Amino acid sequence: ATPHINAQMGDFADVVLMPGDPLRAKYIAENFLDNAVQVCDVRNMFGYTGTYKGRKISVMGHGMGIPSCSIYVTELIKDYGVKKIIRVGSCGAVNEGIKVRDVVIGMGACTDSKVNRIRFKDHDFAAIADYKMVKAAEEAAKARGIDVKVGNLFSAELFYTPDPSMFDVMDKYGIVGVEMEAAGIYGVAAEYGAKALAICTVSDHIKTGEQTTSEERQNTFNEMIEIALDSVLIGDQA
Amino acid sequence: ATPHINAQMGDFADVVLMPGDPLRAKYIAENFLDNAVQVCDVRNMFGYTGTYKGRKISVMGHGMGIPSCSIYVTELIKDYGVKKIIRVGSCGAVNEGIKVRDVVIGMGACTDSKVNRIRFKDHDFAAIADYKMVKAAEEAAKARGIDVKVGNLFSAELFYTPDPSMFDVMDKYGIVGVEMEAAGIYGVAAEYGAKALAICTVSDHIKTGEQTTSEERQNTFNEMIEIALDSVLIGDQAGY
Amino acid sequence: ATPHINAQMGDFADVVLMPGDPLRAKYIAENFLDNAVQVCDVRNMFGYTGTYKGRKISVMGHGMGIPSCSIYVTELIKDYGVKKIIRVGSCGAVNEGIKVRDVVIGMGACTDSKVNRIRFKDHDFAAIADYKMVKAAEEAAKARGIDVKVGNLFSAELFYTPDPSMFDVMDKYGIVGVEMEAAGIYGVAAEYGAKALAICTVSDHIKTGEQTTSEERQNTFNEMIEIALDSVLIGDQAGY
Amino acid sequence: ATPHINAQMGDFADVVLMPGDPLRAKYIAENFLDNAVQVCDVRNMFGYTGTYKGRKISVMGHGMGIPSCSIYVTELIKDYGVKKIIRVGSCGAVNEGIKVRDVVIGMGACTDSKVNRIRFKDHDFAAIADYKMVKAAEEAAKARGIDVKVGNLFSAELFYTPDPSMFDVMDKYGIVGVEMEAAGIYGVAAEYGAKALAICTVSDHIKTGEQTTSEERQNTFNEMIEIALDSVLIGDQAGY
Amino acid sequence: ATPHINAQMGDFADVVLMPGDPLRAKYIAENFLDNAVQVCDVRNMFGYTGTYKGRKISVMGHGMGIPSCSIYVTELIKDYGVKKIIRVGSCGAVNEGIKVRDVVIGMGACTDSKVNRIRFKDHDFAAIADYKMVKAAEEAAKARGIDVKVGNLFSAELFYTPDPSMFDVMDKYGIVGVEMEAAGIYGVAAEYGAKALAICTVSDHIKTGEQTTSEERQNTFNEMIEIALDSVLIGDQAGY
Amino acid sequence: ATPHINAQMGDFADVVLMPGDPLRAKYIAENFLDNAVQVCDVRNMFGYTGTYKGRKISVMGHGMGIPSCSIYVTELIKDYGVKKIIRVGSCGAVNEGIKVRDVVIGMGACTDSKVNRIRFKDHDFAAIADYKMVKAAEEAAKARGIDVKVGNLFSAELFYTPDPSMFDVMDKYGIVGVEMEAAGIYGVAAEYGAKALAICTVSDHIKTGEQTTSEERQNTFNEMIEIALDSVLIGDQAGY
């Protein structure tokens, strides 16, 4: 066991879906997997393993923000043999053409965190997803007739930002959604030589102020989950 | 409600103890407070309000790392009228003379986060506790005969750091414990005009490799909790 | 006319292939395009427009390094209506699994340049290609039976670097090739609302020392050219 | 013996009061210590040793600015065996409720200098005073009925700042005074394993433009001296 | 041969004039040198060697921007035995009193590039010319009755800058011209132990918007060439 | 009067020589100027005005380090009408061919200070001397048969540096002397539109350990004083 995960090697599948909300992981396990079993619950950070169409798949919360998800992702990779991480998150939109409930896929993630500069000799690391995982997710979406935008996320350090003018800069630069984790997840994946992807559902609009309820974020973002799960199967086939 | 707390204004006391672990907050509420009631549970981040020797006090988890605790601390101050935050955390020691289960108090907190540079025009903001809160914590510890070191914490971004040589730099500079939150909490406190303090129990020795179990971290760090709660009463005194 | 391009609006197609070397552009126009006409030659930076399998396409050199290519790409987009840029470059390999003449596609581009920090309030801009352009290139490669790797490039400021230890960091982080341009091109595309992709042919192995000749770089990297041109046709398909 | 101090080991007490102004050091020695003797004068930077209530105490100027004071503080600690440094300085107020002649105590010191980034791998070092020294000064002030604010100083590089908008930022973040030294002194004390504290008298109001005369700064800031001296005796107590 | 220069040792003189434009190099070689022969042409980057009043002199393009010119200048110095580089460039004026066709000499060059930080442990390297080269050029100009301003250039990374407000900062600080190369050439010269100088003719006024044609930049900036060539002879003198 | 200078407009000449050490300023005034009178003495920072060969000249200490000298030089320029500042300092050598007592001239000054980044939007300001002042000083030296090196100083923040490996980088980049002021003085001069120069006598060798005494630094660096004063008269010449 680790300080953060009360599980043993083998308890996780080699692919893990990760929302920041452990109650969304519970929702995913109970409603999309067969034979689901809870495998960890330290700090209430619930993780589960079950099967989807014959395929062993895990789902586990990562908490909010880069330093939180970095602990969980690093442990899964280095202690539990995990090969692929798919973050299944929420995000706030800054572009007028991107609506609440749209699904976006972060091929890259910008950030105002220092973590990748710490890794990368204070130069610019382009925090990117694994291409084949991006392609598999886009393809899974198309097959279900779900529209997705593939582009840059922005992984924010401060949800309550003292610099809101930066949202306009994000919009100008084509950022598809604001969250707080992907750039960190992609940094860990590169560091440890694993593969990662972040898929998010727009849960609020930073410009219009439109919101979803805590309950909707927890229980109703089903399209991203279907896309994520199908993309796992597509990945196995190639 | 806010996106992260399903409570109403008035539901929290004006002072809140905050461990990173919502199960530690549950433990504190159930074992140290009278009249305890759970006031929130979004994302499993449990928060409670009760009384300690008659004084209304809340306790709530803040999650791990600066971006997480910044969310919760900001909301408590700006949305729930909270005046004082006492982080009751764990930490790793870098100094050979600081032992697992030692209690330390962060008058200041160093960090490798960018959050305070973002706030402070890319200059060095010294992330500090409120002085009277520090003094009250130290004097609560003295009364109970619990030894404490008061000094600099280091709030790390990366628990699994790619730069372990930094630990010896921290030690050379007198850092008393490594955690992942205080510098962010002190930044929010200054930005929003409130007061904060971080008190931590050493749960790991970073030099030797010693690590307490998950369960120990959750339910057995009683000294810091006693100090924290007594410090609230001390700090309430007229003219303290 | 601009200071760097003596051409008229309309003289370029809405897609432009850009090698660093204006003589590689000449090679491409003369050997891969039909009815090519030279449209510019300021500073010996040759550009041409012709057709490929009926589709109007331009090819123009961008010189070496981020500041050079930034000028040409910016002008093409803002002054010449160009919508899509495909850099067709060379690069150095840092991974021993990657060989001279391998073709790599930069879905992202790391850099030690300050240009994106200048644009992006000193934060980390993830300099990325347009996804549909990456997909079209990878599919064009497959249709030709050409192996490719899709990953991070590193756009270097100093070819003669004072810090060769950085190559090992690049390799550890999975950089598929070192060049000097993509991160700048991707920054311009995003700043000006256009689309870009960099495909490169490995021309040097930085670990082993293998180095192709100038003539080889100029006239013999055909596979990347084939992939770029084919990818334009794929990218044109309605609904792609 | 050192390039900046023409004294011998033993000439300084283990506690040194340090104003920036060597003439304020002379004022202090002549008016607050008994039997003070001058022990150094290189570069006109006067230092003295005498007794206060029989207790050996030194006072010596440190010049203006982080690089100047760092030289002197470093030498005192590493070459003259000094254990505690109490800066007795002036400062400019940025908060309207803070007045000329108010005494402030720097539990922390923010800065726009690069010196601590140089020491601390380019991370944020929270430049803090020694806690017991803060507490002793605070308590000495209360015993004399002198109000003091305990909080963050801001140690500035440029007295004539090109960025006066930063003063508004300091005020919003609760900075109690602007001086030019504490963050550097605190950085030295941590690097060399000693203890330090900065106590300052407000000599300038940065918002209103009020400025005391050079005469006043040199010979009339008596309260901070009384507090500093009393705090030495308080801090000497075995179990303090 | 190198990947950028198809010449051998001995093909270049020990002093090389370098415009960014290889066609300006051709112009110089054809009209100001005797018996100029073309010694390289890779990537269309023309270089020539002839004589001026019997003295062996080379002229070669360096392309646009710091990363491009760094390649060529580094190769000339380390692979071709070159001792002195004289950039003969264009530049944009930011001062009202500096006019198109004025000749300026960069004793130093500011920059927004990261290259010298990369070289100089992230500190500030003052990118400066060789003093005697500055003196020879200034004296050559005076002997010709040509007025020159000697001061700081600014070597820009982005010609199409997203921060035009920086031009006013340059003007306030006395920058005599903005180009894109000098700070990088000066860093290479210092890194490799050679000597360099940048002399530039104002081709654009950034404040007034006035411009010259590409043809003018290429074929008509004669005063800087005459000054540069005269300065080589002056600088050759024993005891200069 | 200012808080740092107890003099009135007119008390200073329009050129001021400035050592860091106010006792060296006294020495210069008493032994090199005619009819010198002391014009200021706040914080023991002695300043004087007299004549050299009939020319009105001032000499005043600036203290140690960039923040200290920035105060005095800024006041001299903006409050006392000063046009030219000649720092007459000491420095440490890092190159094995530069010896104690050699005289060097800082045409540029590198620095690890943040001051010019603060001024210059976080870019690289090349902190340079005024060209005619450098030329006049070099030519004054030659006329006295005094050999001088003209190049980059390094203005250090931390005399007791925690990074002595930086000295090798300085040597590799051709730094002629290490002091603690020039880069600051040059930035002030540029900010306020005045002119400055730093001439320094090597007072110790950072590589070999060789030193000079406090008394030698104060009273025996005559060559640099003679050069500085002579350079004033040369610089006054019409048309120089």
Ligand SMILES: O=c1[nH]cnc2c(C[N@@H+]3C[C@H](CO)[C@@H](O)C3)c[nH]c12
């Ligand atoms: O406005 C926003 N800023 C930053 N992140 C988010 C997200 C995505 N998640 C939600 C959660 C903070 O609410 C953190 O894990 C990032 C939704 N909306 C926003």
Ligand SMILES: O=c1[nH]cnc2c(C[N@@H+]3C[C@H](CO)[C@@H](O)C3)c[nH]c12
């Ligand atoms: O070894 C350590 N490194 C960094 N932080 C901590 C802490 C403090 N908390 C505990 C939790 C990570 O275990 C995060 O909220 C920071 C205990 N031990 C260590």
Ligand SMILES: O=c1[nH]cnc2c(C[N@@H+]3C[C@H](CO)[C@@H](O)C3)c[nH]c12
């Ligand atoms: O070894 C290398 N380092 C950096 N870039 C390149 C490239 C790519 N191009 C080629 C050209 C430098 O030769 C510049 O445009 C970058 C090939 N090899 C290397």
Ligand SMILES: O=c1[nH]cnc2c(C[N@@H+]3C[C@H](CO)[C@@H](O)C3)c[nH]c12
């Ligand atoms: O207005 C101010 N700005 C910055 N520092 C100070 C100080 C403190 N000291 C005084 C002295 C500059 O006068 C230097 O040692 C810093 C007093 N007033 C001000």
Ligand SMILES: O=c1[nH]cnc2c(C[N@@H+]3C[C@H](CO)[C@@H](O)C3)c[nH]c12
């Ligand atoms: O307006 C300008 N900004 C930056 N550089 C230049 C130059 C000097 N050269 C010209 C060329 C870019 O046109 C590049 O090599 C730098 C002339 N005008 C300007």
Ligand SMILES: O=c1[nH]cnc2c(C[N@@H+]3C[C@H](CO)[C@@H](O)C3)c[nH]c12
């Ligand atoms: O070794 C050295 N490091 C930095 N500066 C100096 C100097 C020049 N002055 C002397 C003085 C520090 O002793 C400060 O004003 C800079 C001489 N030697 C050294």
